[PDB]
């Protein structure tokens, strides 16, 4: 009776999920929704069991009673003796990236420029940068800071969606799923790489994984790290190698969430699923790899080494931390106690 229903966001994730479902022998089956919020609703209704969420979405799900179950864990440097599944998470660096050729663009001259965001409500793409901007300008009119943007999830007829391109046909403009060309970490970075936007709000890893031949994708194969600069909060610009000293915040890792009454069951299935399809899995790269999808980051981030257990059985507030949680609450005053559904 240990069957788990995963929630896929958009048709590309659905496709990957179906493959996983086939290989799992129906231990995992798939539900699909157009947006992450819709997937959250499916979980609440008990029509789906779980999905992997960015920190920003964990906050939404948390208010509605969903709980973190396992966290994405990437390549470490320390803790190297301890196993991946037991190793603590280090969190990723949220950064703002610009073209080197775009001289004189600093943090202090971002107003009226063109911005690329992963999606509304996400940590590096929205919550961190817009929280900082709202704070600095003392205004809730974050919708009027940049001249134009691609922020998937915003009103398709607003300036916040002006730069979004939609799918292979121009349909689904600004939808918060991989159908939108400039959606997510990869899409937001592509938005910058193609000079549609002036700045991209992504995490540190995105820059590295899509430059100097790390990505064989059409738009990325010719990109060089040296051609990019990170915007620091002190008004300086640094090479992408200096992320440790030039980031906007440290973000809590993406995590699997489920309804609390299903948490234990979801955990045991997943631990077994990754033994089969994880980084060193029995059937990866032979038959299926759960953490691969050609830089598209479908279901999970492509740089995920393993899903790790969470020390101290944390609530959603403890995981994201009190630092990050307070930032979100303040930004959400612009747009204390309620589930948003
Ligand atoms: C006071 C208000 C707190 C905020 C709200 C409550 C949060 C409650 C949970 C957080 C507990 C704090 C750290 C405990 C931890 O598990 O982590 C390290 C301990 O690891 C081990 O070796 C355990 C080995 C176990 C063997 C025994 C079986 C050391 O911690 C330090 O190093 C860790 C990796 O080297 C980072 O995870 C951690 O930061 C964390 O990194 C991420 C970036 C994320 N953004 C987190 O939000 C951040 N921490 C906080 C508190 O925000 C960092 O401070
Ligand atoms: C935008 O501005 C608000 C207002 O300052 C920032 O919220 C504030 O965040 C700090 C740190 O999270 C909170 O201060 C304190 O933290 C210490 C722990 O170090 C704690 O001991 C104190 O009780 C206190 O919370 C502060 O409470 C909080 N202020 C308010 C009014 O909620 C927010 O972080 C800023 N946004 C961004 C993205 O920086
Ligand atoms: C930013 O992210 C990049 C890529 O995720 C990190 O570079 C990787 O670091 C590991 C060891 O920590 C190396 O073994 C990998 O080969 C690197 N990946 C690539 C694609 O080059 C980098 O360490 C991160 N920077 C910070 C400051 O966290
Ligand atoms: C392909 C696959 O995942 N098969 C599993 C099998 O290993 C396991 O005995 C059972 C309960 O865990 O569920 C099924
Ligand atoms: Fe994220
Ligand atoms: Zn820092
Ligand atoms: Zn606790």
GROMACS .gro file of C-alpha atoms and ligand atoms in nm:
model
  479
    1UNK     CA    1   0.000   0.000   0.000
    2UNK     CA    2   0.316   0.212  -0.022
    3UNK     CA    3   0.222   0.397  -0.342
    4UNK     CA    4   0.311   0.767  -0.377
    5UNK     CA    5   0.148   1.021  -0.610
    6UNK     CA    6   0.392   1.289  -0.725
    7UNK     CA    7   0.271   1.629  -0.846
    8UNK     CA    8   0.429   1.746  -1.171
    9UNK     CA    9   0.416   2.114  -1.267
   10UNK     CA   10   0.355   2.152  -1.642
   11UNK     CA   11   0.380   1.906  -1.936
   12UNK     CA   12   0.761   1.864  -1.934
   13UNK     CA   13   0.764   1.757  -1.569
   14UNK     CA   14   0.466   1.531  -1.642
   15UNK     CA   15   0.673   1.357  -1.911
   16UNK     CA   16   0.967   1.299  -1.673
   17UNK     CA   17   0.729   1.179  -1.400
   18UNK     CA   18   0.566   0.924  -1.633
   19UNK     CA   19   0.909   0.781  -1.717
   20UNK     CA   20   0.989   0.758  -1.344
   21UNK     CA   21   0.647   0.599  -1.285
   22UNK     CA   22   0.710   0.333  -1.551
   23UNK     CA   23   1.055   0.247  -1.411
   24UNK     CA   24   0.927   0.242  -1.052
   25UNK     CA   25   0.671  -0.024  -1.145
   26UNK     CA   26   0.390   0.207  -1.030
   27UNK     CA   27   0.543   0.270  -0.687
   28UNK     CA   28   0.523   0.632  -0.792
   29UNK     CA   29   0.237   0.765  -1.004
   30UNK     CA   30   0.176   1.114  -1.139
   31UNK     CA   31  -0.065   1.401  -1.094
   32UNK     CA   32  -0.020   1.715  -1.303
   33UNK     CA   33  -0.111   2.080  -1.256
   34UNK     CA   34  -0.034   2.403  -1.444
   35UNK     CA   35   0.121   2.586  -1.147
   36UNK     CA   36   0.301   2.502  -0.823
   37UNK     CA   37   0.014   2.653  -0.622
   38UNK     CA   38  -0.230   2.417  -0.794
   39UNK     CA   39  -0.001   2.127  -0.703
   40UNK     CA   40  -0.012   2.246  -0.340
   41UNK     CA   41  -0.393   2.238  -0.356
   42UNK     CA   42  -0.388   1.882  -0.492
   43UNK     CA   43  -0.170   1.771  -0.199
   44UNK     CA   44  -0.406   1.938   0.050
   45UNK     CA   45  -0.705   1.760  -0.103
   46UNK     CA   46  -0.513   1.432  -0.079
   47UNK     CA   47  -0.520   1.382  -0.456
   48UNK     CA   48  -0.140   1.402  -0.468
   49UNK     CA   49   0.118   1.320  -0.198
   50UNK     CA   50   0.430   1.525  -0.262
   51UNK     CA   51   0.650   1.748  -0.474
   52UNK     CA   52   0.984   1.926  -0.444
   53UNK     CA   53   0.954   2.301  -0.368
   54UNK     CA   54   1.166   2.615  -0.366
   55UNK     CA   55   1.193   2.785  -0.026
   56UNK     CA   56   0.937   3.049  -0.123
   57UNK     CA   57   0.673   2.786  -0.199
   58UNK     CA   58   0.754   2.594   0.123
   59UNK     CA   59   0.638   2.904   0.309
   60UNK     CA   60   0.302   2.899   0.126
   61UNK     CA   61   0.262   2.523   0.179
   62UNK     CA   62   0.370   2.561   0.543
   63UNK     CA   63   0.090   2.804   0.623
   64UNK     CA   64  -0.147   2.539   0.489
   65UNK     CA   65  -0.002   2.265   0.712
   66UNK     CA   66   0.232   2.089   0.469
   67UNK     CA   67   0.570   1.979   0.608
   68UNK     CA   68   0.929   1.938   0.479
   69UNK     CA   69   1.026   1.571   0.440
   70UNK     CA   70   1.366   1.552   0.267
   71UNK     CA   71   1.596   1.821   0.127
   72UNK     CA   72   1.798   1.848  -0.194
   73UNK     CA   73   2.165   1.805  -0.108
   74UNK     CA   74   2.441   1.905  -0.349
   75UNK     CA   75   2.821   1.863  -0.362
   76UNK     CA   76   2.978   1.970  -0.034
   77UNK     CA   77   3.333   2.059   0.066
   78UNK     CA   78   3.327   1.982   0.439
   79UNK     CA   79   3.139   1.700   0.615
   80UNK     CA   80   3.307   1.485   0.346
   81UNK     CA   81   3.325   1.172   0.565
   82UNK     CA   82   2.953   1.168   0.645
   83UNK     CA   83   2.714   1.014   0.390
   84UNK     CA   84   2.509   1.239   0.158
   85UNK     CA   85   2.171   1.135   0.299
   86UNK     CA   86   2.295   1.218   0.652
   87UNK     CA   87   2.498   1.528   0.563
   88UNK     CA   88   2.351   1.868   0.665
   89UNK     CA   89   2.235   2.106   0.391
   90UNK     CA   90   2.442   2.418   0.317
   91UNK     CA   91   2.187   2.628   0.125
   92UNK     CA   92   2.250   2.810  -0.201
   93UNK     CA   93   2.367   3.163  -0.279
   94UNK     CA   94   2.114   3.403  -0.430
   95UNK     CA   95   2.290   3.637  -0.673
   96UNK     CA   96   2.218   3.914  -0.924
   97UNK     CA   97   2.395   3.863  -1.257
   98UNK     CA   98   2.469   4.114  -1.536
   99UNK     CA   99   2.674   4.126  -1.857
  100UNK     CA  100   3.031   4.252  -1.820
  101UNK     CA  101   2.979   4.452  -2.141
  102UNK     CA  102   2.702   4.630  -1.949
  103UNK     CA  103   2.943   4.866  -1.772
  104UNK     CA  104   2.832   5.106  -1.498
  105UNK     CA  105   2.534   4.891  -1.405
  106UNK     CA  106   2.543   4.842  -1.029
  107UNK     CA  107   2.299   4.760  -0.752
  108UNK     CA  108   2.235   5.135  -0.711
  109UNK     CA  109   2.146   5.185  -1.078
  110UNK     CA  110   1.892   4.904  -1.118
  111UNK     CA  111   1.590   5.134  -1.133
  112UNK     CA  112   1.422   5.145  -1.477
  113UNK     CA  113   1.638   4.858  -1.603
  114UNK     CA  114   1.510   4.525  -1.738
  115UNK     CA  115   1.488   4.227  -1.499
  116UNK     CA  116   1.474   3.847  -1.531
  117UNK     CA  117   1.317   3.649  -1.244
  118UNK     CA  118   1.279   3.273  -1.192
  119UNK     CA  119   0.912   3.321  -1.099
  120UNK     CA  120   0.698   3.519  -0.855
  121UNK     CA  121   0.722   3.385  -0.496
  122UNK     CA  122   1.055   3.205  -0.541
  123UNK     CA  123   1.358   3.267  -0.315
  124UNK     CA  124   1.645   3.385  -0.540
  125UNK     CA  125   1.422   3.501  -0.825
  126UNK     CA  126   1.178   3.711  -0.623
  127UNK     CA  127   1.158   3.706  -0.242
  128UNK     CA  128   1.520   3.807  -0.173
  129UNK     CA  129   1.569   4.070  -0.447
  130UNK     CA  130   1.222   4.229  -0.421
  131UNK     CA  131   1.239   4.224  -0.040
  132UNK     CA  132   1.567   4.416  -0.055
  133UNK     CA  133   1.425   4.658  -0.315
  134UNK     CA  134   1.100   4.726  -0.123
  135UNK     CA  135   1.309   4.790   0.187
  136UNK     CA  136   1.556   5.023   0.015
  137UNK     CA  137   1.290   5.225  -0.167
  138UNK     CA  138   1.046   5.226   0.128
  139UNK     CA  139   0.771   5.152  -0.124
  140UNK     CA  140   0.539   4.858  -0.194
  141UNK     CA  141   0.532   4.957  -0.561
  142UNK     CA  142   0.785   4.686  -0.654
  143UNK     CA  143   0.584   4.655  -0.977
  144UNK     CA  144   0.716   4.994  -1.093
  145UNK     CA  145   1.085   4.957  -1.010
  146UNK     CA  146   1.201   4.788  -1.331
  147UNK     CA  147   1.085   4.924  -1.668
  148UNK     CA  148   1.010   4.571  -1.794
  149UNK     CA  149   1.055   4.218  -1.657
  150UNK     CA  150   0.985   3.851  -1.701
  151UNK     CA  151   0.849   3.735  -1.367
  152UNK     CA  152   0.647   3.418  -1.437
  153UNK     CA  153   0.326   3.421  -1.232
  154UNK     CA  154   0.256   3.794  -1.261
  155UNK     CA  155  -0.033   3.939  -1.465
  156UNK     CA  156   0.041   3.859  -1.834
  157UNK     CA  157  -0.064   4.213  -1.934
  158UNK     CA  158   0.155   4.391  -1.677
  159UNK     CA  159   0.509   4.518  -1.734
  160UNK     CA  160   0.624   4.235  -1.505
  161UNK     CA  161   0.542   3.993  -1.789
  162UNK     CA  162   0.646   4.212  -2.085
  163UNK     CA  163   0.975   4.027  -2.142
  164UNK     CA  164   0.839   3.673  -2.106
  165UNK     CA  165   0.816   3.484  -2.437
  166UNK     CA  166   0.583   3.186  -2.376
  167UNK     CA  167   0.631   2.850  -2.549
  168UNK     CA  168   0.748   2.738  -2.895
  169UNK     CA  169   0.431   2.911  -3.022
  170UNK     CA  170   0.399   3.222  -2.803
  171UNK     CA  171   0.127   3.050  -2.601
  172UNK     CA  172   0.142   3.037  -2.219
  173UNK     CA  173   0.322   3.373  -2.197
  174UNK     CA  174   0.435   3.423  -1.834
  175UNK     CA  175   0.295   3.092  -1.697
  176UNK     CA  176   0.492   2.975  -1.393
  177UNK     CA  177   0.606   2.643  -1.544
  178UNK     CA  178   0.873   2.524  -1.788
  179UNK     CA  179   0.647   2.600  -2.088
  180UNK     CA  180   0.752   2.962  -2.045
  181UNK     CA  181   1.088   2.999  -2.221
  182UNK     CA  182   1.233   3.221  -1.946
  183UNK     CA  183   1.097   3.028  -1.645
  184UNK     CA  184   1.308   2.912  -1.349
  185UNK     CA  185   1.682   2.934  -1.286
  186UNK     CA  186   1.776   2.830  -1.640
  187UNK     CA  187   1.511   3.046  -1.809
  188UNK     CA  188   1.595   3.356  -1.606
  189UNK     CA  189   1.963   3.311  -1.691
  190UNK     CA  190   1.878   3.260  -2.060
  191UNK     CA  191   1.676   3.584  -2.042
  192UNK     CA  192   2.001   3.759  -1.944
  193UNK     CA  193   2.224   3.561  -2.181
  194UNK     CA  194   2.009   3.663  -2.479
  195UNK     CA  195   2.016   4.029  -2.366
  196UNK     CA  196   1.638   4.043  -2.320
  197UNK     CA  197   1.699   4.158  -1.962
  198UNK     CA  198   1.975   4.361  -1.796
  199UNK     CA  199   1.987   4.158  -1.476
  200UNK     CA  200   1.895   3.803  -1.376
  201UNK     CA  201   1.811   3.700  -1.021
  202UNK     CA  202   1.927   3.341  -0.992
  203UNK     CA  203   2.149   3.135  -0.766
  204UNK     CA  204   2.528   3.103  -0.798
  205UNK     CA  205   2.524   2.753  -0.942
  206UNK     CA  206   2.311   2.852  -1.242
  207UNK     CA  207   2.590   3.074  -1.380
  208UNK     CA  208   2.850   2.795  -1.355
  209UNK     CA  209   2.629   2.521  -1.498
  210UNK     CA  210   2.539   2.718  -1.812
  211UNK     CA  211   2.879   2.861  -1.912
  212UNK     CA  212   3.213   2.746  -2.056
  213UNK     CA  213   3.066   2.434  -2.219
  214UNK     CA  214   2.889   2.294  -1.910
  215UNK     CA  215   2.563   2.317  -2.104
  216UNK     CA  216   2.544   2.195  -2.463
  217UNK     CA  217   2.215   2.382  -2.511
  218UNK     CA  218   2.192   2.602  -2.821
  219UNK     CA  219   2.183   2.937  -2.638
  220UNK     CA  220   2.442   2.841  -2.373
  221UNK     CA  221   2.719   2.653  -2.560
  222UNK     CA  222   2.902   2.979  -2.643
  223UNK     CA  223   2.872   3.156  -2.306
  224UNK     CA  224   3.186   3.237  -2.105
  225UNK     CA  225   3.200   3.300  -1.728
  226UNK     CA  226   3.430   3.599  -1.781
  227UNK     CA  227   3.151   3.778  -1.971
  228UNK     CA  228   2.937   3.795  -1.656
  229UNK     CA  229   2.951   3.996  -1.332
  230UNK     CA  230   2.777   3.968  -0.995
  231UNK     CA  231   2.616   4.273  -0.836
  232UNK     CA  232   2.712   4.313  -0.470
  233UNK     CA  233   2.507   4.507  -0.216
  234UNK     CA  234   2.793   4.755  -0.158
  235UNK     CA  235   2.763   4.887  -0.516
  236UNK     CA  236   3.060   4.691  -0.652
  237UNK     CA  237   3.078   4.436  -0.936
  238UNK     CA  238   3.279   4.114  -0.899
  239UNK     CA  239   3.367   3.813  -1.114
  240UNK     CA  240   3.140   3.511  -1.069
  241UNK     CA  241   3.420   3.340  -0.872
  242UNK     CA  242   3.356   3.578  -0.579
  243UNK     CA  243   2.999   3.468  -0.499
  244UNK     CA  244   3.099   3.388  -0.140
  245UNK     CA  245   3.164   3.761  -0.087
  246UNK     CA  246   2.907   3.903  -0.332
  247UNK     CA  247   2.562   3.746  -0.282
  248UNK     CA  248   2.223   3.885  -0.179
  249UNK     CA  249   2.147   3.607   0.071
  250UNK     CA  250   2.196   3.241   0.152
  251UNK     CA  251   1.883   3.046   0.057
  252UNK     CA  252   1.747   2.730   0.217
  253UNK     CA  253   1.759   2.431  -0.019
  254UNK     CA  254   1.459   2.308  -0.217
  255UNK     CA  255   1.276   2.039  -0.022
  256UNK     CA  256   1.013   1.769  -0.064
  257UNK     CA  257   0.690   1.861   0.112
  258UNK     CA  258   0.386   1.649   0.189
  259UNK     CA  259   0.084   1.650   0.413
  260UNK     CA  260   0.193   1.576   0.771
  261UNK     CA  261  -0.020   1.260   0.796
  262UNK     CA  262   0.158   1.124   0.485
  263UNK     CA  263   0.513   1.241   0.571
  264UNK     CA  264   0.648   0.909   0.703
  265UNK     CA  265   0.519   0.712   0.407
  266UNK     CA  266   0.654   0.961   0.150
  267UNK     CA  267   0.994   0.956   0.322
  268UNK     CA  268   1.044   0.578   0.311
  269UNK     CA  269   0.936   0.547  -0.056
  270UNK     CA  270   1.169   0.829  -0.164
  271UNK     CA  271   1.472   0.694   0.024
  272UNK     CA  272   1.418   0.368  -0.167
  273UNK     CA  273   1.350   0.544  -0.498
  274UNK     CA  274   1.682   0.728  -0.479
  275UNK     CA  275   1.867   0.403  -0.399
  276UNK     CA  276   1.744   0.290  -0.741
  277UNK     CA  277   1.756   0.611  -0.947
  278UNK     CA  278   1.984   0.850  -0.753
  279UNK     CA  279   2.340   0.966  -0.825
  280UNK     CA  280   2.503   0.625  -0.769
  281UNK     CA  281   2.174   0.438  -0.819
  282UNK     CA  282   2.143   0.077  -0.931
  283UNK     CA  283   1.953   0.174  -1.247
  284UNK     CA  284   2.114   0.513  -1.318
  285UNK     CA  285   2.250   0.588  -1.575
  286UNK     CA  286   2.140   0.244  -1.704
  287UNK     CA  287   1.763   0.290  -1.719
  288UNK     CA  288   1.663   0.610  -1.538
  289UNK     CA  289   1.819   0.897  -1.343
  290UNK     CA  290   1.587   1.091  -1.112
  291UNK     CA  291   1.824   1.388  -1.090
  292UNK     CA  292   1.883   1.433  -1.465
  293UNK     CA  293   1.684   1.627  -1.725
  294UNK     CA  294   1.948   1.812  -1.932
  295UNK     CA  295   1.981   2.136  -1.727
  296UNK     CA  296   1.601   2.178  -1.729
  297UNK     CA  297   1.580   2.104  -1.355
  298UNK     CA  298   1.261   1.897  -1.392
  299UNK     CA  299   1.111   1.773  -1.061
  300UNK     CA  300   1.450   1.817  -0.894
  301UNK     CA  301   1.754   2.034  -0.959
  302UNK     CA  302   2.004   1.866  -1.191
  303UNK     CA  303   2.291   1.933  -0.948
  304UNK     CA  304   2.123   1.729  -0.671
  305UNK     CA  305   2.350   1.459  -0.532
  306UNK     CA  306   2.084   1.312  -0.303
  307UNK     CA  307   1.778   1.386  -0.095
  308UNK     CA  308   1.887   1.416   0.268
  309UNK     CA  309   1.710   1.354   0.599
  310UNK     CA  310   1.629   1.661   0.808
  311UNK     CA  311   1.797   1.699   1.147
  312UNK     CA  312   1.566   1.777   1.438
  313UNK     CA  313   1.234   1.703   1.261
  314UNK     CA  314   1.190   2.074   1.177
  315UNK     CA  315   0.865   2.256   1.111
  316UNK     CA  316   0.860   2.467   0.794
  317UNK     CA  317   0.956   2.776   0.999
  318UNK     CA  318   1.261   2.609   1.151
  319UNK     CA  319   1.387   2.485   0.814
  320UNK     CA  320   1.367   2.811   0.619
  321UNK     CA  321   1.489   2.976   0.938
  322UNK     CA  322   1.366   3.284   1.120
  323UNK     CA  323   1.590   3.510   0.911
  324UNK     CA  324   1.428   3.409   0.581
  325UNK     CA  325   1.076   3.377   0.728
  326UNK     CA  326   1.076   3.739   0.851
  327UNK     CA  327   1.187   3.867   0.509
  328UNK     CA  328   0.890   3.695   0.341
  329UNK     CA  329   0.634   3.825   0.592
  330UNK     CA  330   0.750   4.185   0.541
  331UNK     CA  331   0.741   4.160   0.162
  332UNK     CA  332   0.396   4.001   0.181
  333UNK     CA  333   0.259   4.307   0.366
  334UNK     CA  334   0.271   4.478   0.027
  335UNK     CA  335   0.061   4.210  -0.146
  336UNK     CA  336   0.002   3.716   1.020
  337UNK     CA  337  -0.226   3.409   1.024
  338UNK     CA  338  -0.391   3.235   0.720
  339UNK     CA  339  -0.351   2.971   0.445
  340UNK     CA  340  -0.376   3.146   0.107
  341UNK     CA  341  -0.639   2.906  -0.035
  342LIG     C1  342   1.839   3.111   1.590
  342LIG     C2  343   1.735   3.121   1.480
  342LIG     C3  344   1.746   2.998   1.387
  342LIG     C4  345   1.657   3.008   1.262
  342LIG     C5  346   1.528   2.927   1.272
  342LIG     C6  347   1.543   2.784   1.326
  342LIG     C7  348   1.627   2.696   1.235
  342LIG     C8  349   1.638   2.560   1.299
  342LIG     C9  350   1.727   2.461   1.224
  342LIG    C10  351   1.867   2.517   1.201
  342LIG    C11  352   1.969   2.472   1.306
  342LIG    C12  353   2.100   2.551   1.295
  342LIG    C13  354   2.217   2.470   1.236
  342LIG    C14  355   2.218   2.319   1.267
  342LIG    C15  356   2.270   2.246   1.144
  342LIG     O1  357   2.211   2.148   1.099
  342LIG     O2  358   2.387   2.294   1.068
  342LIG    C16  359   2.522   2.263   1.109
  342LIG    C17  360   2.527   2.143   1.204
  342LIG     O3  361   2.559   2.038   1.112
  342LIG    C18  362   2.612   1.907   1.143
  342LIG     O4  363   2.730   1.883   1.112
  342LIG    C19  364   2.520   1.804   1.203
  342LIG    C20  365   2.584   1.664   1.210
  342LIG    C21  366   2.480   1.577   1.279
  342LIG    C22  367   2.543   1.458   1.351
  342LIG    C23  368   2.457   1.411   1.470
  342LIG    C24  369   2.365   1.301   1.423
  342LIG    C25  370   2.598   2.387   1.161
  342LIG     O5  371   2.536   2.508   1.112
  342LIG    C26  372   2.612   2.591   1.022
  342LIG     O6  373   2.670   2.509   0.919
  342LIG    C27  374   2.575   2.432   0.837
  342LIG    C28  375   2.650   2.346   0.734
  342LIG     O7  376   2.795   2.350   0.758
  342LIG    C29  377   2.461   2.518   0.777
  342LIG     O8  378   2.352   2.427   0.758
  342LIG    C30  379   2.405   2.623   0.876
  342LIG     O9  380   2.314   2.724   0.820
  342LIG    C31  381   2.191   2.682   0.757
  342LIG    O10  382   2.223   2.653   0.617
  342LIG    C32  383   2.124   2.669   0.512
  342LIG    C33  384   2.184   2.780   0.426
  342LIG    C34  385   1.982   2.714   0.550
  342LIG     N1  386   1.964   2.841   0.481
  342LIG    C35  387   1.953   2.733   0.700
  342LIG    O11  388   1.834   2.814   0.712
  342LIG    C36  389   2.079   2.789   0.771
  342LIG     N2  390   2.055   2.792   0.916
  342LIG    C37  391   1.967   2.872   0.977
  342LIG    C38  392   1.957   2.858   1.126
  342LIG    O12  393   1.899   2.952   0.915
  342LIG    C39  394   2.520   2.693   0.951
  342LIG    O13  395   2.466   2.795   1.040
  343LIG     C1  396   1.340   4.442   0.530
  343LIG     O1  397   1.328   4.511   0.651
  343LIG     C2  398   1.284   4.442   0.764
  343LIG     C3  399   1.278   4.538   0.881
  343LIG     O2  400   1.405   4.557   0.939
  343LIG     C4  401   1.374   4.328   0.799
  343LIG     O3  402   1.313   4.260   0.906
  343LIG     C5  403   1.388   4.242   1.029
  343LIG     O4  404   1.483   4.137   1.026
  343LIG     C6  405   1.569   4.126   1.139
  343LIG     C7  406   1.660   4.006   1.115
  343LIG     O5  407   1.586   3.897   1.064
  343LIG     C8  408   1.494   4.115   1.274
  343LIG     O6  409   1.577   4.161   1.380
  343LIG     C9  410   1.608   4.066   1.481
  343LIG     O7  411   1.675   3.946   1.459
  343LIG    C10  412   1.735   3.900   1.577
  343LIG    C11  413   1.817   3.774   1.555
  343LIG     O8  414   1.939   3.813   1.499
  343LIG    C12  415   1.627   3.873   1.677
  343LIG     O9  416   1.696   3.835   1.791
  343LIG    C13  417   1.546   3.998   1.707
  343LIG    O10  418   1.433   3.971   1.785
  343LIG    C14  419   1.497   4.061   1.579
  343LIG    O11  420   1.396   3.985   1.521
  343LIG    C15  421   1.369   4.204   1.280
  343LIG    O12  422   1.278   4.150   1.374
  343LIG    C16  423   1.294   4.225   1.148
  343LIG     N1  424   1.208   4.341   1.160
  343LIG    C17  425   1.075   4.338   1.152
  343LIG    C18  426   1.005   4.470   1.168
  343LIG    O13  427   1.009   4.236   1.132
  343LIG    C19  428   1.381   4.239   0.677
  343LIG    O14  429   1.465   4.131   0.706
  343LIG    C20  430   1.425   4.319   0.554
  343LIG     N2  431   1.417   4.242   0.436
  343LIG    C21  432   1.525   4.195   0.381
  343LIG    C22  433   1.511   4.107   0.264
  343LIG    O15  434   1.635   4.218   0.423
  344LIG     C1  435   2.877   2.798  -0.683
  344LIG     O1  436   2.826   2.684  -0.749
  344LIG     C2  437   2.926   2.619  -0.828
  344LIG     C3  438   2.863   2.505  -0.913
  344LIG     O2  439   2.759   2.444  -0.840
  344LIG     C4  440   3.034   2.561  -0.738
  344LIG     O3  441   3.138   2.501  -0.818
  344LIG     C5  442   3.141   2.356  -0.798
  344LIG     O4  443   3.207   2.321  -0.676
  344LIG     C6  444   3.232   2.183  -0.654
  344LIG     C7  445   3.298   2.164  -0.518
  344LIG     O5  446   3.234   2.244  -0.421
  344LIG     C8  447   3.320   2.131  -0.767
  344LIG     O6  448   3.359   1.997  -0.745
  344LIG     C9  449   3.240   2.142  -0.896
  344LIG     O7  450   3.317   2.094  -1.005
  344LIG    C10  451   3.198   2.287  -0.923
  344LIG     N1  452   3.104   2.286  -1.034
  344LIG    C11  453   3.126   2.343  -1.154
  344LIG    C12  454   3.015   2.328  -1.254
  344LIG     O8  455   3.228   2.405  -1.184
  344LIG    C13  456   3.093   2.670  -0.648
  344LIG     O9  457   3.175   2.607  -0.550
  344LIG    C14  458   2.982   2.754  -0.581
  344LIG     N2  459   3.040   2.868  -0.517
  344LIG    C15  460   3.011   2.897  -0.392
  344LIG    C16  461   3.085   3.010  -0.334
  344LIG    O10  462   2.929   2.834  -0.325
  345LIG     C1  463   1.083  -0.090  -0.883
  345LIG     C2  464   1.048  -0.073  -0.737
  345LIG     O1  465   1.061   0.037  -0.683
  345LIG     N1  466   1.003  -0.184  -0.676
  345LIG     C3  467   0.964  -0.190  -0.536
  345LIG     C4  468   1.027  -0.306  -0.460
  345LIG     O2  469   1.167  -0.293  -0.462
  345LIG     C5  470   0.979  -0.312  -0.315
  345LIG     O3  471   0.996  -0.443  -0.266
  345LIG     C6  472   0.832  -0.269  -0.291
  345LIG     C7  473   0.815  -0.213  -0.150
  345LIG     O4  474   0.923  -0.129  -0.115
  345LIG     O5  475   0.786  -0.172  -0.384
  345LIG     C8  476   0.813  -0.207  -0.519
  346LIG    FE1  477   1.520   2.837  -0.530
  347LIG    ZN1  478   2.623   3.624   0.330
  348LIG    ZN1  479   1.182   2.194   1.634
   0.00000   0.00000   0.00000
